[PDB]
Ligand binder design. Structure first.
Ligand SMILES: O=C(O)c1cc(C(=O)O)c2c(n1)C(=O)C(=O)c1cc(C(=O)O)[nH]c1-2
Ligand SMILES: O=C(O)c1cc(C(=O)O)c2c(n1)C(=O)C(=O)c1cc(C(=O)O)[nH]c1-2
Ligand SMILES: [Ca+2]
Ligand SMILES: [Ca+2]
Ligand SMILES: [Ca+2]
Ligand SMILES: [Ca+2]
Lengths: 582, 582
């Protein structure tokens, strides 16, 4: 029974393995383990550490995968290490040869692998997907799906899913490069051959694929949501061919409706005026299928439903953060099967997963300015006056700067949130900060960044940046807050030991009490932590795993925040923690 | 009063700080701490780690030093780190700018800093000595003492001395470069200005310096132990200008007699025939002042005595391993104030530190092929029949191969031994291995290696390479042995808790019982360990620390042992360990 569909399907229930990004199909980041709890945490201790070496460091975002005592882990610069759960012995490794003309936007990171049958899977920075035998380090198949030289890569974990209609098992993966003016795409593949079953673009009017040849087209062909141009070949504006909406994070899956649930990324160029008719109003010129959660049909890759989070993303509020399936108990009576999401744009969304109908929406980060709230009968944010920054005055190649919050780095970025089955709360790794944003000149050039805006990131408050927050999904309340001097960039994990775990920027692994927020335990690993920890049972013992090594976007795009973070050291390791055997 | 001569001189007794390489002027690597002992050692646990980062890894050989609350540690590629001893937080860093064309022979490593007054001191890879303010890392002075382009470097810890006659405090340091054809030199400098007080060459007939002016000649001017050459401009064979005997490790210091006791390295080239008269006998052409232990006068830099380990070192048995100072209770009767040494050539020596006379010699490794024993009245090896390899028969471009053991890597390399004041034993980090050796052509070419020989290192035994042995210095017996699969390439620490500590090439920091040799405790750190561990007490707690990050000579010169070692991960980091509070 070596990695079957039901092992995957049951994966949030079985404490002795971890088979995918999220610790379940619902991506709840929850575990029923209680060996480690709030009265004995004070004793947690490192069991062993593995260093990735090779003189290759930079950000380490990977969530590890454990199956039958082998941790499968990914490292920067497209590597995969297979390790003995109990000792930290190395079993095998794979190194991808990386061309010299790669261009990932926000550091050479990788977020995980998937296991199915006897194979291990992961995406690579030159835009490929590789399959390896879980026992050997032997490559079984490789497919390169896009031109890296034009801006594509892959940084996110792939997932496995089963079509409840056709019976087939699929490998689901996304793509990356909104910043480079790429057309984002979603894909399905055959696990044993890596052959393209289906391909689906997420900018409105683009041509999708099915069993090898073209199929249908995403929405209307005329593409009413993007501005027309009766001079260019397409009739549409240039941005239309460089639109964006790339799903650079991972899917989530619901067996009960036979639906894939995935986020779409920000549209291209950043500038709202490249995607609005001259003269014109950026209010209903939505850049259809960008910066929202998309419901997808497993059998054909056609769009089932869609709930957009920033109708005309002027700010790069990339709206593809993760979707956790929970049971929403309205506010009195009706349990609703829902999606939950803590977006880049500062608000928390409760969406009906049966059809993408908004149920509750509210802020999770303090002083928001681009929007006052989300108008519930309409599903649309109610913006503020100067928040789409104005075009330059005649003669100026830069326009007037406006103070926005949150900044493009967001209220929360990809690092992921956990759901607690016992307390009902979502534990969100958020940040408090803002920026100056201003318009510049916009034009597309293959292999170049395609923003069209200028920016600077800066503090919001004097005493802190990172904000661990316990949010109640029905009332929209902050049950508790833990504050930190550096930003927060690690995932969170919740357990039936009444514990919350995460890592910080200055290198500690920490444990928090899940009802009150009190700091109970920390350990200094030696580099800032930017990944999601996991936990598991092994031959009767509770284990914790965290990947260590600072990186990601802050160092390269953070502004003041790059400066704060200059003294954090680089690293590259995996660490396993547990209770002393003696 | 911050770090005075009296702090340094009582350095072996003060459990509170660590001020120099060897944890005392006698280099014993002995601690009277007993908090951690043979009955409670199984609870020892990591306290914190620090990552060196910079994407700069390779071999990490440093001995940390401690005082007030701060750890000063050295890293690969010339870098110095000051760390808070309780927390591991970084206080300051100093990165030396290195040129692109340095040429260390045996990896980019450093063995430690020294300390005196308000200053820290260390050698750099472009052959310089640097002085840093202790409280911050600003540079006070820095002296480039030789040319790196011609092959000089520095890798060994400097040390601090007080000349008893003159009252003056000196900074003592050596040089490195025997494989490139250099004149090995020892230097004494003023601690506050960096100013050369004296310079002594360890090749016979070369000129010294005293107060910036030429002083005296080492030994006889005519250098009779080096072959003559009418028709040469110097009067001597070419190799006398490139003769070696560099003091690449560190001094020991005896205040009772006022003597600086150090090792001199191997002669250059390895080829015995370039240091023998055409058609003469390698015997008595000695290659004076190479591969032995030297007693030197701190006042003038002059040689007081010399004991040769290998007289015409044909094997690169670099004869400068550490010298420990101890009291030798003869065999029966006498207490001799002695030197203790475990040579690269595989013989342990015991010598009288007042006059350089041989008291005893026996083998600490098992299958020595180059010499039968050491003749106790003569002081000389009794060499075997064809163990200096023969020249190429006329027309050949390499001579025939002979099997030698130990090989140039040694029975013991630099990785120092330790002594137990309780048990009376030496704990040596030895290895069993051997090689095929043969002759090639020899020619000097500035900035390029000067061997004149071919070689191939090979295992001796199928079940183990590394051999951790407890040696009795009065009878010559191996009282206990512990065996390891990979080479042994770290230092040893000995304590009053009945314990000896060391690190292995597969990444374990280990504890053994000192009286019987049993492994009691082990922790997996992530990469191979190649540094000497220390210990110190702070706020009633006993800390252990160790530098981690595999490297050194094996992965480059090791041959079959370069391939055994291939899958051991690089790293770079410091680790501190302690007993659990509860
Ligand atoms: O739209 C994109 O196509 C794209 C890709 C990624 C990435 O692939 O990691 C980043 C982003 N977006 C992005 O906006 C960004 O702020 C972000 C930060 C991180 C990071 O790993 O810390 N990844 C990315
Ligand atoms: O003769 C020299 O001048 C020289 C220096 C060093 C060095 O400086 O590290 C090595 C050697 N010798 C040496 O023989 C060699 O065996 C060696 C091993 C190592 C080590 O760090 O791994 N260095 C040295
Ligand atoms: Ca599971
Ligand atoms: Ca983006
Ligand atoms: Ca001391
Ligand atoms: Ca040498």
């Amino acid at each position: 029974k070596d990695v079957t569909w039901e092992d995957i399907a049951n994966d949030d229930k079985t404490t002795g393995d971890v088979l995918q990004y999220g610790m379940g199909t619902h991506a709840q980041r929850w575990s029923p383990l209680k060996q480690v709890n709030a009265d004995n945490v004070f004793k947690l201790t490192p069991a062993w550490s593995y260093s990735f070496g090779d003189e290759k460091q930079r950000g380490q975002e990977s969530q590890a995968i454990v199956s039958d005592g082998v941790i499968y882990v990914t490292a920067s610069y497209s590597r995969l290490f297979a390790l003995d759960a109990k000792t930290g012995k190395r079993l095998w490794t794979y190194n991808h040869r990386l061309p010299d003309d790669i261009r990932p936007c926000c550091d050479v990171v990788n977020r995980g692998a998937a296991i199915y049958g006897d194979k291990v899977f992961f995406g690579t920075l030159d835009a490929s997907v590789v399959a390896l035998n879980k026992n050997t380090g032997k490559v079984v198949w490789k497919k390169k799906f896009a031109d890296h030289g034009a801006g594509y890569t892959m940084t996110g974990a792939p997932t496995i899913v089963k079509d409840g209609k056709t019976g087939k098992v699929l490998l689901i993966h996304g793509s990356s490069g909104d910043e480079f003016g790429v057309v984002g795409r979603l894909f399905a593949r055959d696990p044993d051959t890596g052959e393209e079953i289906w391909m689906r673009p997420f900018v409105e009017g683009h041509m999708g694929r099915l069993n090898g040849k073209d199929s249908t087209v995403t929405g209307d062909v005329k593409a009413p949501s993007w501005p027309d141009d009766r001079n260019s070949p397409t009739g549409k504006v240039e941005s239309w061919s460089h639109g964006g909406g790339a799903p650079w994070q991972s899917a989530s899956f619901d067996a009960e409706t036979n639906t894939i649930i995935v986020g779409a990324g920000n549209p291209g160029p950043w500038n709202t005026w490249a995607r609005t008719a001259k003269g014109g109003n950026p209010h209903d010129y939505d850049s259809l299928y960008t910066s929202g959660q998309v419901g997808v049909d497993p059998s054909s890759g056609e769009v089932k439903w869609f709930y957009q989070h920033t109708p005309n993303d002027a700010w790069d509020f990339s709206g593809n953060n993760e979707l956790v399936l929970f049971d929403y108990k309205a506010k009195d009576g009706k349990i609703v099967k829902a999606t939950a999401h803590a977006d880049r744009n500062g608000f928390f969304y409760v969406v009906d997963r049966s059809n993408g109908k908004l149920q509750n929406a509210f802020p999770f980060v303090d002083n928001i300015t681009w929007a006052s709230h989300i108008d519930l009968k309409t599903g649309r944010p109610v913006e503020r006056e100067g928040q789409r920054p104005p075009l330059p005055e005649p003669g100026q190649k830069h326009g007037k700067a406006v103070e926005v919050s949150p900044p493009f780095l967001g209220g929360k970025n990809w690092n992921p949130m956990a759901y607690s089955q016992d307390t009902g709360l979502f534990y969100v790794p958020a940040n408090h900060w803002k920026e100056d944003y201003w318009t510049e000149e916009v034009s597309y050039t293959k292999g170049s960044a395609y923003l069209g805006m200028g920016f600077r990131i800066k503090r919001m408050y004097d005493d802190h940046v990172g904000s661990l927050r316990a949010m109640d999904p029905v009332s929209g309340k902050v049950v508790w807050e833990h504050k930190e001097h550096l930003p927060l960039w690690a995932g969170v994990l919740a357990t039936a030991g009444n514990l919350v775990f995460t890592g910080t920027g200055d290198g500690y692994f920490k444990a928090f009490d899940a009802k009150s927020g009190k700091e109970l335990w920390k350990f200094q690993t030696g580099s800032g932590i930017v990944s999601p920890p996991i936990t598991w049972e092994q031959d009767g013992e509770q284990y914790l795993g965290v990947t260590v090594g600072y990186g990601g976007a802050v160092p390269l795009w953070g502004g003041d925040m790059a400066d704060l973070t200059r003294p954090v050291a680089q690293g590259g390791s995996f660490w396993v923690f547990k209770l002393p055997s003696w």
